[PDB]
Amino acid sequence: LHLTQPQILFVRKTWNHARNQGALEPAISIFRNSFFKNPEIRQMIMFGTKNEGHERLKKHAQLFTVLMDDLIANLDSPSATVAGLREAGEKHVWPTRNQYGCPFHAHLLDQFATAMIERTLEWDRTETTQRGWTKIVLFVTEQLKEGFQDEQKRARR
Numbered sequence: 128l129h130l131t132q133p134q135i136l137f138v139r140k141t142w143n144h145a146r147n148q149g150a151l152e153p154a155i156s157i158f159r160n161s162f163f164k165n166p167e168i169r170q171m172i173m174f175g176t177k178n179e180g181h182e183r184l185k186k187h188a189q190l191f192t193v194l195m196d197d198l199i200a201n202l203d204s205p206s207a208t209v210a211g212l213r214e215a216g217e218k219h220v221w222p223t224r225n226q227y228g229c230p231f232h233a234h235l236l237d238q239f240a241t242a243m244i245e246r247t248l249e250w251d252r253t254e255t256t257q258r259g260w261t262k263i264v265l266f267v268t269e270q271l272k273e274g275f276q277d278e279q280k281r282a283r284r
């Protein structure tokens with residue numbers, strides 16, 4: 128991660144503003160936008176009964192909120208959140224690939240990145256400071272991808 132200080136200030140101001148939307152926001156809105164980018168993501172996260180699906184989305188938002196909160200508070204050295212992100216990615220390796228209807232692949236996280244970047248634009252902006260969000264989202268989804276791909280490559284087929 129290489130954010131400039133003006134980028135760090137802008138990201139923190141907009142993030143804390145976004146968190147004002149609710150306990151699990153903006154995480155929930157980010158997941159919902161990924162559902163729009165790719166409805167298969169929704170089919171997977173909402174797999175099962177109405178309750179099960181909603182609980183899974185809630186838990187996803189809860190954990191992502193914690194990881195993001197920690198990352199943003201620690202933009203100076205985020206090794207802890209790096210491990211956490213790789214671990215989260217790792218959790219998407221399932222012996223039966225279509226256990227949840229559609230298999231997980233790294234491309235889903237690229238779509239998630241697009242969804243998240245779109246949301247950041249909704250949260251005194253300049254192109255240079257806004258690029259702080261692009262850096263953060265790329266970092267986050269890259270660590271998720273590495274966690275998943277390293278784990279999936281190692282698993283039996």
Ligand code: HEM
Binds near residue numbers: 169194227236
């Ligand atoms: C990119 C699209 C994503 C899809 C389609 C997806 C879907 C799923 C599915 C189907 C499971 C297995 C069912 C379950 O354990 O609840 C799971 C597990 C998990 N996911 Fe995701 N997820 C996505 C992104 C993320 C992200 C960004 C995070 C970051 C926090 C995350 C964190 C986790 C964790 C921690 C588990 C293990 C849950 C547990 O053991 O209770 N996922 N995910």
Ligand SMILES: [Pr+3]
Binds near residue numbers: 214217
């Ligand atoms: Pr592990």
Ligand SMILES: [Pr+3]
Binds near residue numbers: 283
């Ligand atoms: Pr298999």
Ligand SMILES: [Pr+3]
Binds near residue numbers: 217278
């Ligand atoms: Pr592992």
